[PDB]
């Protein structure tokens, strides 16, 4: 089962519990209502970059299954919802309203609304239009003011059904596995091209800060970052070299600039090819003031010294437990993160907007019993009271995922659900885990 003491403050209403999606990974539809193509469409219809066939012209047909779905958000007993907006759907190639892809969003707002949930929306999961990556995407500025334009657009039509809005998802992955490391969409792999990228994202979320504020006034406004925790492969002092690295170019890179304006200065010495090029006045623009930071954690790494990359990715030397997509279970390390950032930093709050574990579930007898993923959120959602009870400001938890999805470069191949998902009748079946979690959440006094 899943846990708390009975006197946590994540048990009181000054807490919230969710559940979370994203756009290209449960709609399908891609060419429904004139939706422009993205580069993940791209992405998948180019040989050996996603797994097997796999593609998202279908995924959970949640664009179809939505009232269906939002019943199932009820039923796990969740106080919040949060999901991603596709800018291929909401507008054409010049710019202008598509009025069919607006409708979309807004009626399932209104009806989850409706029904008494929370609304966490994030603008920018990943799905580019593709007509912006053919004049360089984000290597070109001006995506940073595309993207202005349509968070404009965006939180006019929406204003008045979503409490908290979030500018971008995980900008490490879309600019460093995107441009630097050729692992995701569109697939480039070079560090002049991945830290460029990330500056443009960065200023893409500080140009449309203002505009958000303006059109939804009555809404909390952030982003949300992902971040693990790095560990040293040894006592050595090579091996503690090896971390540094790993987590400034990780971790640093990103809530650096957010928080004080700058990145970090120690690759001037170190490697001047990971920083970018700033113009005037981009940092006064990239540090803002933000209502909130979203937090997606799963796992640790260790590091080793290497002559040529400076870090090397090892396993743990110890025996430890690994999910399916092979990453370590290590709940500690995740206490252990917020509070070092809480010491380095002075934070806005914090929501936990991502946290879940990759199972090899099968459905038998007509349930799935996904007794590691059970294990894997009792011991995380426990973490999260432990930083709390620390000193440190936290005030939700959103577990990944509502229900199995399309996962990037490994494609179906790897099931995050608290909802088993048959993807050749569609059917939803709630997994053993998320039985547990309605059961924690239904018994709040």
Known sequence: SITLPSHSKMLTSDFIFGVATASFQIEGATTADNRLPSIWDTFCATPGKVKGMDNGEVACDHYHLWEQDIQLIKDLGVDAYRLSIAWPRVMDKKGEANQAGLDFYRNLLKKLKAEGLTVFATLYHWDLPQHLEDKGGWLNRETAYQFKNYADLVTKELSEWVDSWATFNEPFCAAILGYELGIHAPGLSKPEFGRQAAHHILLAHGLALPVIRKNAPKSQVGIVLNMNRSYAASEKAEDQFACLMRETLDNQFFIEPLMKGQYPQLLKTVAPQYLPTVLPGDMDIISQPIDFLGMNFYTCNHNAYDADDMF?????????????????????????????????????????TENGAACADQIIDGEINDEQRVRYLDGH??????????????????????????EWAEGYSKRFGLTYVDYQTQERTIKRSGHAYRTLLNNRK
């Open 381 to 406: 959602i426990n973490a999260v009271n432990h930083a709390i009870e620390s000193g440190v400001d936290i005030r939700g938890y959103f577990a990944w995922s509502l229900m199995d999805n399309f």
């Open 312 to 352: 090397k990715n090892v396993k743990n030397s110890q025996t430890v437990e690994y999910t399916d997509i092979g990453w370590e279970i290590a709940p500690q390390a995740f206490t252990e993160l917020l509070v070092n950032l809480h010491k380095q930093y002075t934070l806005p709050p914090i929501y936990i």
